[PDB]
Design a protein around this ligand. Structure first.
Ligand SMILES: Nc1ncnc2c1ncn2[C@@H]1O[C@H](CN2CC#Cc3nc4c(N)ncnc4n3[C@@H]3O[C@H](CNC(=O)CC(=O)NCC2)[C@@H](O)[C@H]3O)[C@@H](O)[C@H]1O
Ligand SMILES: Nc1ncnc2c1ncn2[C@@H]1O[C@H](CN2CC#Cc3nc4c(N)ncnc4n3[C@@H]3O[C@H](CNC(=O)CC(=O)NCC2)[C@@H](O)[C@H]3O)[C@@H](O)[C@H]1O
Ligand SMILES: Nc1ncnc2c1ncn2[C@@H]1O[C@H](CN2CC#Cc3nc4c(N)ncnc4n3[C@@H]3O[C@H](CNC(=O)CC(=O)NCC2)[C@@H](O)[C@H]3O)[C@@H](O)[C@H]1O
Ligand SMILES: Nc1ncnc2c1ncn2[C@@H]1O[C@H](CN2CC#Cc3nc4c(N)ncnc4n3[C@@H]3O[C@H](CNC(=O)CC(=O)NCC2)[C@@H](O)[C@H]3O)[C@@H](O)[C@H]1O
Lengths: 264, 264, 264, 264
């Protein structure tokens, strides 16, 4: 069917992209970067993340495929030397799709209760713009804790191996429809108390962050960091939307984890 | 219907038990500690754990209710002063049942491949009997890591607020059918490498521990610690069985968590 | 001798300051905020920190005294109700001085090797201005590690109970002339490796941070955060300078720690 | 002068020992395992630890030298292929001694206040024999905290890279005369509170552990684990004694750390 290819932009990835397009020219494959059904990303996890966000409004109609040109990427599970077999297998089709959960972030402002939403494949974080970060943490309309620290991180399953991981979070299998909240350097003395442990939330649970004094927050969705002013609320929930991968061979998540962290 | 009552054994819990039995004598409630349908536990979480294990072969036919006589217990969500309202509400019935996942541990030995299974409500841990603890960690028949340390802990959801928590694990809502593995003081240098992060596993994933040199392990299921010799394998999976609680009012898990750890 | 008094600025602290000045008017005590020998800080730890930095060029000739108007401060070990006894004891003199180590940060730039130094009582941190933070860590001219993460924190002894503490650092007694380095969310996979553990350095050891790609860093000394461009090197060492406290009664550091973190 | 050689016991270490003895036979070097001045350890860190404890009553008259036959040991900073140069350099003498602090553990019992002391080069730990571990932590006769968990670890400087490290402790340079206390899986809820952070103590500070209910503790000094009954107190302090190493070339501690943990 229709397809397109994003590239990291170096000479290695651009050449691999050009050879794959020439390979695809020998089948019933039309290049179309407007409404593709197959998106191929050539580079690292960052390149894959940009591919996902470029097409986040057609997630139900796209299958993603990652090729890593350097060190093994987590979302990129094909090596450059296998690109010929990939073109051939992909042209035939009969591939099986695998779906990973996603995270929805909603930012409500004051003056009109204006509201922006974002979809994350790795995580969504909040920090303070300059001053101290203080926020009230509400779970399903229940006041859970007042958080003082450097920020918070809300991670998808497949994002738990990213940044969640460096903050002490747990790695969880992507078949679990959930989101995980981790703290960044929480203050804990006799006056200030937080839970400490990471928190894993099921679908339909809503985590809401509410400003205590300062209302300016730097919010990061995957790789893009946006400043927001006069914030009234930040809402987190497991998204109804899902990212679909094309799979041509078993590469189990824990094998993926073993290779990226233990030995390869 | 039929019911029974376990007690911590002090004068406070025994008296509360005797008054509740006298209260139950004024309804259509028969005391039967052989085949009850309602098990009431009076004491702390340990007392509740013993109640669960005493009746672990009739989990499908029993609803559990916890009363805490001292500090708030996690499984005991009724205060002593509410025992009259409990007797009355429980006598009427029309209560809603809530189910939490459980963990199954299987220990296979050498010589006959003899095999013992255990059901845990908090967690199941492994340690070495004396010598250094070394074990190969296999996930769904894939060799994941060689673990060197003091031991490992496999936790249920409702167990993540217990001991999992002190080992750095994440707290996860009991609606998530999963198990979480945490490390006890893993060795990590240039020669010895483990994942570090806790691991959360979905239903039907099988974590298997295999002895490397020493084959004697002290295994703990909730509160009981048993020594096993000539161990060939330890298998962990989310159990098919579930513990059922009787609920007469909303006490949300995160409110339970807030009260036990933040403030009350 | 000569003295001055800083205040948090609220009505409580300003009134306490005015009453202490009137109390000091009945002794041989001259108010002089240019060249004092006694600096009294009225407020919290932040107020004390500002008092220290305001007079950091006369540390050898000043003794500091902290009064906390709200929650117990760590550097402020006098309650408001004891201000009369403080004025009286302080007027007599015969007090014993206690000295805490300090940290020296040196920032060398390109183009002229221009160089700025700062003195910290809590800690000095480095972060990236926007982009990813990557730095080579050199200890006494030995390349120790390439650090990838959110930043680093270099703490004094008395600063280890502050921010060092929230990053997993150890609390160390101020009699130990040392500095402690902690990581902020280090990346650790198969390609990127850091030590993980905090590092404690003796006097005369020099920790040097060197930019790898990006050369813009947001550097924070205690409470003030300054952006630096075209940075070539950041050097850390235990300072030759020391902060001196006036002590009128034993308040041991571990008792101070117990009261601020365990119970009071 | 006089010397002796301990060996791991495998064919590699025994042969290396025999060749070094034959090499030493060509100088003014007498073999004497009763009162040596040079102790050479051939094996790993465990072999070195046993060498240290075998001669712990003559620490002031002995210099230690480590050769590692397998993976790089931390106390063994010579490779097997350098044994000839070692024999030659060691025979000449004119070597410089380097001294590391040590830890003293004192166990007082009931009935006669009987008292045993131990010297540790790595660490000394306490655990419970079977039941739950509960202990009151007293610092210089000040009640600091009631600890509930799996145990505690008191580490020397050179021991902080060992086991202290796996418990979250800081790595500190051996020139710092100090000891570091780390927790094993402390319980922390609304009723039970510990400090959490590791604690670093200077010389002359005395940490004392006092039983709360159970008085039986399994105490481990380096590699030997001894059970003690009717314990009244466990006292920790930096020892007056020191271990002396023979050094023939600069191998800085942080280079040693880099090679054992970062890359080699
Ligand atoms: N303190 C932090 N610690 C750990 N991760 C962090 C930290 N801060 C941000 N991140 C992650 O970076 C993503 C953004 N990256 C793009 C990426 C990525 C990614 N995704 C996953 C995943 N799902 N599982 C396992 N490894 C993953 N990596 C790996 O991550 C590395 C890339 N990061 C950087 O070096 C810094 C950066 O920010 N770079 C920009 C591009 C590479 O090895 C890549 O294969 C943020 O979304 C945040 O998750
Ligand atoms: N290092 C450890 N850190 C933390 N927890 C640990 C540790 N070692 C064992 N455990 C837990 O103890 C359970 C066994 N306990 C019985 C209990 C319990 C329990 N269960 C939960 C839960 N699900 N959520 C939240 N708090 C919980 N607590 C609370 O736990 C305390 C009781 N523990 C002890 O003081 C020690 C003990 O072992 N005592 C025996 C009886 C009480 O406040 C109780 O309300 C082991 O199963 C292991 O989970
Ligand atoms: N993620 C962090 N976690 C922990 N501490 C952090 C974090 N980020 C910065 N800091 C510290 O703040 C100091 C700056 N503060 C002034 C302060 C302070 C201070 N110093 C010590 C000490 N030596 N020991 C023990 N508690 C201490 N506190 C206590 O700290 C609290 C004040 N912090 C804030 O709420 C935020 C802030 O930044 N506020 C500005 C004023 C109060 O309870 C105060 O009694 C930075 O220097 C950094 O150390
Ligand atoms: N959970 C734990 N995590 C980490 N360390 C632990 C743990 N439990 C005990 N220890 C240490 O073991 C010493 C006893 N060991 C002998 C040893 C050792 C040693 N000392 C240092 C040091 N000072 N710096 C850096 N690495 C060190 N190692 C390295 O340690 C490894 C040996 N350990 C084991 O595999 C297990 C064991 O116990 N084995 C017996 C012999 C080897 O790579 C060795 O080069 C206990 O004293 C305790 O410190």
């Amino acid at each position: 069917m229709k397809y397109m290819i994003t590239s990291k932009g170096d000479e290695k990835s651009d050449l691999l992209r050009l050879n794959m397009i020439a390979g695809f020219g020998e089948y019933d494959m039309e290049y179309d970067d407007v409404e593709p059904e197959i998106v191929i990303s050539i580079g690292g996890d960052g390149t894959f993340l940009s591919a996902f966000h470029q097409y986040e409004e057609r997630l139900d109609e796209i299958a993603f495929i990652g090729i890593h040109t350097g060190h093994l990427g987590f979302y990129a599970d094909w090596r450059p030397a296998e690109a010929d077999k990939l073109v051939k297998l992909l042209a035939k089709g009969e591939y099986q799709k695998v779906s990973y959960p996603l995270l929805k972030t909603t930012v409500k402002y004051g003056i009109g209760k204006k509201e922006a939403t974002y979809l994350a494949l790795n995580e969504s974080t909040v920090k303070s713009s300059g001053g101290p970060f203080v926020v009230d943490v509400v779970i399903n309309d229940i006041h859970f804790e007042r958080f003082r620290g450097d920020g918070l991180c809300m991670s998808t399953p497949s994002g738990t191996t990213a940044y969640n991981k460096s903050l002490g979070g747990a790695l969880m299998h992507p078949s679990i429809e959930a989101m995980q909240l981790t703290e960044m350097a929480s203050i804990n003395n006799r006056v200030y108390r937080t839970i400490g442990s990471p928190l894993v939330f099921p679908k339909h649970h809503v985590v809401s962050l509410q400003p205590v004094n300062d209302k300016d927050f730097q919010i990061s969705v995957d790789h893009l960091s946006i400043l927001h002013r006069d914030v009234q609320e930040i809402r987190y929930e497991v998204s109804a939307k899902k990212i679909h991968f094309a799979r041509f061979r078993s590469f189990p998540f824990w094998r993926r984890v073993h290779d990226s962290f233990i030995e390869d």
